[PDB]
Structure formats: structure tokens, C-alpha cells
Design an enzyme around this catalytic site. Structure first.
Site, PDB file in Angstrom:
ATOM      1  N   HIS A  15      -2.540  -1.327  -3.519  1.00  0.00           N
ATOM      2  CA  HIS A  15      -3.991  -1.294  -3.481  1.00  0.00           C
ATOM      3  C   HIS A  15      -4.546   0.081  -3.133  1.00  0.00           C
ATOM      4  O   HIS A  15      -3.829   0.943  -2.671  1.00  0.00           O
ATOM      5  CB  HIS A  15      -4.513  -2.367  -2.528  1.00  0.00           C
ATOM      6  N   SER A  53       0.806  -1.209   0.000  1.00  0.00           N
ATOM      7  CA  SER A  53       0.000   0.000   0.000  1.00  0.00           C
ATOM      8  C   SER A  53       0.838   1.257   0.000  1.00  0.00           C
ATOM      9  O   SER A  53       1.537   1.546  -0.959  1.00  0.00           O
ATOM     10  CB  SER A  53      -0.923   0.008   1.203  1.00  0.00           C
TER      11      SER A  53
HETATM   12  C1  LIG Z   1      -9.791   6.041   2.441  1.00  0.00           C
HETATM   13  C2  LIG Z   1      -8.699   6.024   3.500  1.00  0.00           C
HETATM   14  C3  LIG Z   1      -7.588   7.008   3.159  1.00  0.00           C
HETATM   15  C4  LIG Z   1      -9.274   6.295   4.885  1.00  0.00           C
HETATM   16  C5  LIG Z   1      -8.317   5.792   5.961  1.00  0.00           C
HETATM   17  N1  LIG Z   1      -7.579   4.659   5.453  1.00  0.00           N
HETATM   18  C6  LIG Z   1      -6.299   4.561   5.734  1.00  0.00           C
HETATM   19  O1  LIG Z   1      -5.689   5.453   6.282  1.00  0.00           O
HETATM   20  C7  LIG Z   1      -5.607   3.311   5.326  1.00  0.00           C
HETATM   21  C8  LIG Z   1      -4.679   2.838   6.427  1.00  0.00           C
HETATM   22  C9  LIG Z   1      -5.284   1.737   7.283  1.00  0.00           C
HETATM   23  C10 LIG Z   1      -4.167   0.870   7.843  1.00  0.00           C
HETATM   24  C11 LIG Z   1      -6.290   0.901   6.498  1.00  0.00           C
HETATM   25  N2  LIG Z   1      -4.809   3.603   4.170  1.00  0.00           N
HETATM   26  C12 LIG Z   1      -4.927   2.926   3.048  1.00  0.00           C
HETATM   27  O2  LIG Z   1      -5.781   2.071   2.883  1.00  0.00           O
HETATM   28  C13 LIG Z   1      -3.946   3.277   1.986  1.00  0.00           C
HETATM   29  C14 LIG Z   1      -3.664   2.393   0.961  1.00  0.00           C
HETATM   30  C15 LIG Z   1      -2.749   2.745  -0.011  1.00  0.00           C
HETATM   31  C16 LIG Z   1      -2.121   3.977   0.054  1.00  0.00           C
HETATM   32  C17 LIG Z   1      -2.408   4.858   1.083  1.00  0.00           C
HETATM   33  C18 LIG Z   1      -3.324   4.507   2.057  1.00  0.00           C
HETATM   34  C19 LIG Z   1      -9.055   5.436   7.224  1.00  0.00           C
HETATM   35  O3  LIG Z   1      -9.600   6.367   7.855  1.00  0.00           O
HETATM   36  O4  LIG Z   1      -9.091   4.238   7.603  1.00  0.00           O
END
Ligand SMILES: CC(C)C[C@H](NC(=O)[C@H](CC(C)C)NC(=O)c1ccccc1)C(=O)O
Ligand code: AV3
Ligand code: AV3
Ligand SMILES: CC(C)C[C@H](NC(=O)[C@H](CC(C)C)NC(=O)c1ccccc1)C(=O)O
EC number: 3.4.21.92
Lengths: 177, 194
Positions: free
Chosen positions: B121, B96
Site C-alpha cells: 500500500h 507495506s
Molecule cells: C507519507 C508517509 C511517508 C509519512 C509517514 N508515514 C510513515 O512513515 C508510514 C509508517 C507508519 C507506520 C504509518 N509509512 C508508510 O505508510 C509506508 C507504506 C509503504 C511503504 C513505506 C512507508 C508519517 O509521518 O507517518
């Protein structure tokens, strides 16, 4: 038994939406209207409402069932008719929508959440705009208010006393009796 | 445990620990999930190493499952702002947001060990965020703006078009080292010097 009184009032063709609108009360409430219409398709059904609101899908089950019924549905706001309660209240047969003198109505826009991948949230958002639009179209239809006013007034919670609710268009009468 | 070791010289004796030794050689270690705390640690290190000698390269060892988006763009921007070149190196996995940091090292200096893997992803949201439809419409736009922003910085560094990237990250895409090389994400696969 609470259920004995509720079945006695059923023979009297009175039914109650007394809780948050969810699938279980909706299915009970939709079953009741199918029954009563099966018994007499020309005698009215009284729906007393006292509700915080709830699921739109559950409410659309009830609303469509209300409308396809052969008889008229009289809706009565006791205590609180809020959000989906307000919708179902305003959705009763025109002229047969009642508010008790100290009932309050609340209307506002839909609430939910988003979750999942960006592509799943994109689709969730498509529906937010689709549904919101239709929800206003319908309330604008029940009340006689322009869709611009429904949208504007719905942005944040707007409360109506019985007298105000009658002005706006949610009900046709205020029961003094 | 994590033992420390002692180096000596005619100028004196120095005790330190593996990571310190690495930092002395201008190597940063990003071996955790990119979160706010982590991002701050790494930025702190980037800026500091850039201060000590801005003409020498900084190396980032990456073994991470990714992390939050704005933490990602915090590190990405620092990596790009700094004067010194950044050699990125994937040891175990860059997934990611880690994959984006791997790709973002200066051209020619992005590499990975032969059995490493890169996962690419699109921004997910494991949690549920709730509110009025008006509040969520805003969120969805921001999540869409974040998604496409990942696609165009990835495009900028892989040489591909954001439309391709956008199509490839629709579902998770796992890459081996050689495949990540082909894809544009890294430049070379390290060979065993034993
Ligand atoms: C839609 C997302 C940005 C909202 C945010 N999600 C995240 O911050 C993910 C990190 C967690 C460990 C799931 N980030 C990603 O899924 C991601 C993937 C690829 C590149 C950058 C970020 C949330 O509020 O959960
Ligand atoms: C009530 O729930 C939902 C209902 C949804 C739904 O219903 C409708 C049905 C008919 C209908 C309208 C509807 F809006 C408007 C209209 C005019 N006619 N239409 C589209 N999307 C929905 C998403 C829902 O929620 C999904 C998230 C909740 N998950 C997470 C946790 C538990 C379950
Ligand atoms: C009983 O609760 C509430 C009742 C509310 C309410 O009731 C009335 C109805 C008719 C009525 C009067 C009312 F006052 C006076 C009158 C004369 N006729 N009118 C407006 N606003 C309310 C907000 C409430 O609670 C809001 C948050 C609580 N939730 C949050 C989470 C759990 C519970
Ligand atoms: C008629 C509206 C204003 C009533 C409002 N209902 C909702 O907004 C629902 C609240 C959740 C079920 C907790 N939401 C939905 O039905 C829904 C439908 C589609 C997508 C997301 C949410 C109320 O508060 O009564």
C-alpha cells in the site's frame, strides 16, 4: 446577563464577533444579519470585531451573508482584528470600515494540516493552492493592494497599528469620536 | 524466557541463544515494525555480516507490518550496497515497507512460506502535521516524492511499470504467497521439507 446586553444592542443593530471564528459564532452571526435585514433593509448593521481569527469556511459563511445583505455592514476593529477577523473587517461596506485608534490588525497566510494517504494529501494540497489564491485575490480586492504584495506580506505574520492599517487599505477611517 | 542452548566441540563449549545461532548462519531477523532503532540494528547487521564474509549470502527473515519510509530506504539501500547476495524470506507477513524489502532481495532468492501474505500500500500518514500553507505545500511534495519513489523501486524489482504499481497500491492489495510470486514480489513458495 451578558446576553441581555447583547440583545439590547441587537435592537440597536449592533453585533459582535468577539471570539475565534468557528461554526457556532458564524451561525449566530449569520442568523443576526438575516434578522436585522428582515427588520430594516435600509438601516445599517454595525459589526464590532475583536478576534484572533479562525475557520475560513466559517468566515465565508459570514462574509457572503454580509455581502448579500440589503443594508450596509459597518465593521469596527476593537482590540484585535486578526487573520479572518481582518478579512471580515476589510469585507465591510467600503467607507464604513472603521478602526479604533489602538486596534491592531494581523494578516498572514492560511494554516491547516495534512493527514492520510499520499493520494489524500495530494488532494489536500490542491486545495491549499486554490484557497490561498482566492484568499489573496479577495484581500487584494478589499485593500487595493496588488496580489503580489498581499502574497508577499502574508507569507509571515504582518501586524498593523490602526494608522498603518488605514494606509494599507484594511479600513477607510479611524474613529476618534 | 527465550532459552539459550549449549553447543560443544573439541575446541570448547559455546552457550548462545536462538538469534545468535541464526546470526552465525548469516540470518537476519526483521520481525518488528521498521522504525529508526530497528533500521539501525539491521543495517549494523548487514554491514557486519558483509564484513565477515562478503562472498557468502545473507538471509533476511521477514515478519513485519512495515514501518517508516526513510527507515525503509535506509535498509533497502544497504541491502543493495552490500556485496553479498540477500535471500529474503517471508514467514508470516511482509506489509507495506516490508513488502518492498521482500521484493528487494536478490533475484531468484526471494521466497515465502505457503501461508504468508504480502500487503502492498501507498505511504499513509496516520498523524496530522500542521503549519502555514507554505509549509504544507512543501510536505505534500515530499510525501508525493516518497510515494512515487516506492512505486519505482517496487517496479524495479517486480518487473512491472511504475504506473501499474501506482494503480495497484491506490488501495491496499493483499497477496497470498502464490499471488506474490505471480506479481513479481517473490520467486518461489517454500515447500514443506517434513
Ligand atoms: C507519507 C508517509 C511517508 C509519512 C509517514 N508515514 C510513515 O512513515 C508510514 C509508517 C507508519 C507506520 C504509518 N509509512 C508508510 O505508510 C509506508 C507504506 C509503504 C511503504 C513505506 C512507508 C508519517 O509521518 O507517518
Ligand atoms: C475549516 O476546515 C476546512 C475547510 C475547508 C474548506 O473551507 C472553505 C469553504 C469555503 C471557502 C473556502 C474554504 F477554504 C475558501 C473560499 C474562498 N471559500 N475548503 C476546503 N477544505 C477545507 C478543509 C478544512 O479542514 C479539514 C481538516 C480539519 N478536519 C480535521 C480535524 C477536524 C476537521
Ligand atoms: C493577547 O495576546 C496577544 C496579543 C497581541 C497583540 O495585542 C494587541 C492588540 C492591540 C493593541 C496592542 C496589543 F498588544 C497594543 C496596542 C497599543 N493595541 N498584538 C500583537 N500580538 C499579540 C500577540 C498575542 O499573543 C500571541 C500568542 C498567544 N496565544 C498563543 C496560544 C494561546 C494564546
Ligand atoms: C484568512 C486566513 C489567513 C485566516 C486564518 N485561517 C486559517 O488559515 C484556518 C485556520 C484553521 C481553521 C485553524 N484554516 C482554514 O480555514 C483551512 C481551510 C482549508 C483547509 C485547511 C485549513 C486564521 O488564522 O484566521
Amino acid at each position: 446577563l451578558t446576553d441581555s446586553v447583547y440583545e439590547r444592542l441587537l435592537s440597536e443593530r449592533i453585533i459582535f464577533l468577539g471570539s475565534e471564528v468557528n461554526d457556532e459564532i458564524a451561525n449566530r452571526l449569520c442568523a443576526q444579519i438575516l434578522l436585522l435585514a428582515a427588520e430594516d433593509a435600509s438601516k445599517d448593521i454595525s459589526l464590532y470585531i475583536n478576534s484572533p481569527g479562525g475557520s475560513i469556511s466559517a468566515g465565508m459563511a459570514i462574509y457572503d451573508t454580509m455581502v448579500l445583505a440589503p443594508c450596509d455592514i459597518a465593521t469596527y476593529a476593537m482590540g484585535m482584528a486578526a487573520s479572518m477577523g481582518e478579512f471580515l473587517l476589510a469585507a465591510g461596506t467600503k467607507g464604513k470600515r472603521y478602526a479604533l485608534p489602538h486596534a491592531r490588525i494581523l494578516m498572514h497566510q492560511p494554516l491547516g494540516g495534512v493527514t492520510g494517504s499520499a493520494a489524500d494529501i495530494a488532494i489536500q494540497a490542491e486545495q491549499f493552492a486554490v484557497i490561498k489564491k482566492e484568499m489573496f485575490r479577495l484581500n487584494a480586492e478589499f485593500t487595493g493592494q496588488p496580489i503580489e504584495r498581499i502574497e508577499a506580506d502574508s507569507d509571515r505574520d504582518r501586524w498593523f497599528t490602526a494608522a498603518e492599517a488605514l494606509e494599507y487599505g484594511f479600513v477607510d477611517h479611524i474613529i476618534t469620536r | 524466557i527465550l532459552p539459550s542452548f549449549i553447543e560443544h566441540s573439541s575446541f570448547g563449549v559455546k552457550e548462545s541463544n536462538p538469534y545468535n545461532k541464526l546470526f552465525e548462519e548469516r540470518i537476519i531477523f526483521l520481525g518488528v515494525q521498521v522504525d529508526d532503532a530497528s533500521a539501525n540494528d539491521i543495517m549494523a547487521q548487514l554491514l557486519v555480516l558483509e564484513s565477515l564474509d562478503p562472498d557468502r549470502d545473507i538471509t533476511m527473515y521477514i515478519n513485519s507490518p512495515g514501518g517508516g519510509f526513510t527507515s525503509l530506504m535506509a535498509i533497502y539501500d544497504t541491502m543493495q550496497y552490500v556485496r553479498a547476495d540477500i535471500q529474503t524470506v517471508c514467514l508470516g507477513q511482509a506489509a507495506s515497507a516490508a513488502a518492498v524489502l521482500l521484493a528487494a532481495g536478490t533475484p531468484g532468492k526471494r521466497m515465502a512460506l505457503p501461508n504468508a501474505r504480502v500487503l502492498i500500500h501507498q505511504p499513509s500518514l496516520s498523524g496530522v502535521i500542521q503549519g502555514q500553507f507554505s509549509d504544507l505545500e512543501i510536505q505534500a511534495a515530499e510525501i508525493e516524492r516518497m510515494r512515487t519513489l516506492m512505486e519505482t523501486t517496487l517496479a524495479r524489482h517486480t518487473g512491472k511499470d511504475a504506473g501499474v504499481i501506482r494503480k495497484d497500491t491506490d488501495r491496499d492489495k493483499i497477496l497470498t504467497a502464490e499471488e506474490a510470486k505471480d506479481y513479481g514480489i517473490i520467486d518461489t513458495v517454500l515447500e514443506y521439507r517434513k
